[PDB]
Amino acid sequence: GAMNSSNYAELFNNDIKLFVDDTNVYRVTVHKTFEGNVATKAINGCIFTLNPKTGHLFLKIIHTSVWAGQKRLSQLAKWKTAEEVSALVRSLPKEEQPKQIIVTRKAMLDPLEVHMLDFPNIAIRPTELRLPFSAAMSIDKLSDVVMKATEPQMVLFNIYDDWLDRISSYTAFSRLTLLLRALKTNEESAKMILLSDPTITIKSYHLWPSFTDEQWITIESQMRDLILTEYGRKYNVNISALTQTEIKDIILGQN
Secondary structure, eight states, X not given: OOBOTTSGXXXXXXXXXXXXXXXXXXXXXXXXXXXXXXXXXXXOEEEEEEOTTTOEEXXXXXXXXXXXXXXXXXXXXXXXXXXXXXXXXXXXXXXXXXXXXXXSSGGGXXXXXXXXXXXXXXXXXXXXXXXXXXXXXXXXXXXXXXXXXXXXXXXXXXXXXXXXXXXXXXXHHHHHHHHHHHHHHOHHHHHHHHHOSXXXXXXXXXXXOOOOHHHHHXXXXXXXHHHHHXXXXXXXXXXXXXXXXXXXXXXXXXX
16 A cells, blocks of 8 residues: 555565665766757766665666667666666565565556566555655765766665764654755755855765764754745745744645
8 A cells, every 4th residue: 555644654664674765877978069059968867766664775876778778768768767676676685575565656566567577566655755765866975976987886885874873763864854855955065065064074984964963953954944944935825923823834745
């Protein structure tokens, strides 16, 4: 069945599950040449495959060469996504194999079901949840590795850095989704917030800066304010006249 706000809690039990988002697999740039010709140029993309309990992100980099000689790349991208998720599953010992794969887009259901036919006890599930994983390319570290790739590459990240040392998976996933929603809403403002003051540093191998628990609470409050402010501007709405419940609803992005 579909994952929704009602059965969301299940994400934080011990059953291994993977989110798969295909939004950034096939990406293009458009630029006008001097001659006036519009060149549509494929750029390196990625499959966002995330374990929300552990933070493990299997970032399969889709190098532009995969599109070589192929037609109707938007359809092909869905199948190449399912192919690579399948390969990943097959690479894992049965212990580490997911019990569920949750696709963020409904169009990914069929290609993944077909690829995973031989895995009878891996549930392929759609979601009614609105999730901001398309904003993964707003995270500089991820965007940089994708662009630098000269060939198909699998890169393993922890999207929670070292947070699980201090906080639960639910708190970590809540922080992650708030950050991505902010980045998606106003990328420039969110990045200004994360850069913080001159005392804050980011580890060379982390995605996010090194904040204290108290600092993270403040950063998260700024992220909530960024989203509300945009909402406020967009709809000419007095965000100070909103109840705490109304504000929480907006922040969680489920419409």
